[PDB]
Amino acid sequence: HHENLYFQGMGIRHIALFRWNDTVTPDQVEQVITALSKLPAAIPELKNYAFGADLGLAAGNYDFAVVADLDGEDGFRAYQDHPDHRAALAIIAPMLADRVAVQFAL
C-alpha cells in the first residue's frame, strides 16, 4: 500500500506463484500470510511488495502470489540472502506442489 517508488538503479519486479500440495490447510495459508507480513526482508533495496491468496476467479489458477520490487541485482541478491527471506522460504517449501517465478525490469 505504497505509494510511489524510487530506484537508484534497475528496478526488478520479482514474482513467484505457488500451487499448494494436498498437505496444505487454510490455517497454514494464514501462517504464510503472517510470515510474509512479518519476515519481509525489508532491506532499503526492497521498495514495495504485495502478496495474497488466489480469489477463485479462474479455473486452473495457482493458489498464491508474492511480488517484490528490488533496486538492482545487488538488491535482489541481498534480498535472497537475508535471514527473513530464508526463514520464509523454509515455511513455504514443504507446502509446495509447484512454484513458478520470473524477475523482470520494471
Add this chain to the structure above:
Amino acid sequence: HHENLYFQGMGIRHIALFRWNDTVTPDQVEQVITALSKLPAAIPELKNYAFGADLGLAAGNYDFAVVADLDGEDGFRAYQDHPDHRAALAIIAPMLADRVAVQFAL
C-alpha cells in the same frame, strides 16, 4: 510507471507467467511487448500494469510476466472481455508452452 492508484472497490492484482515453446524467437517476444504496450485494454478499471521478459537471474524461471491491477470483479470481467485483451491473448496463445496465473486482493 505510475504513480499511486485509487480503487473504488476491491483492487485485484492479476498475474500471468508465461513459458515459451520452441516456436518462439526474440523478435516474437518483441511483438508481445509491442502488443501488451499498444493493446492494454485500458478501461477506467485498469489502474496499473507492468510486463516484461525474464532477466535470467534464476535457473528454472519462466520467460515472461504480465501484471494488471483492476478495480473490482466487474473491472476484471470487463478487462477479460475487452477487444484489446482478446487480441493480445490471440498473439500469445500459439507461443505458449505453459501459462500460470493468480488473481489476489491487493
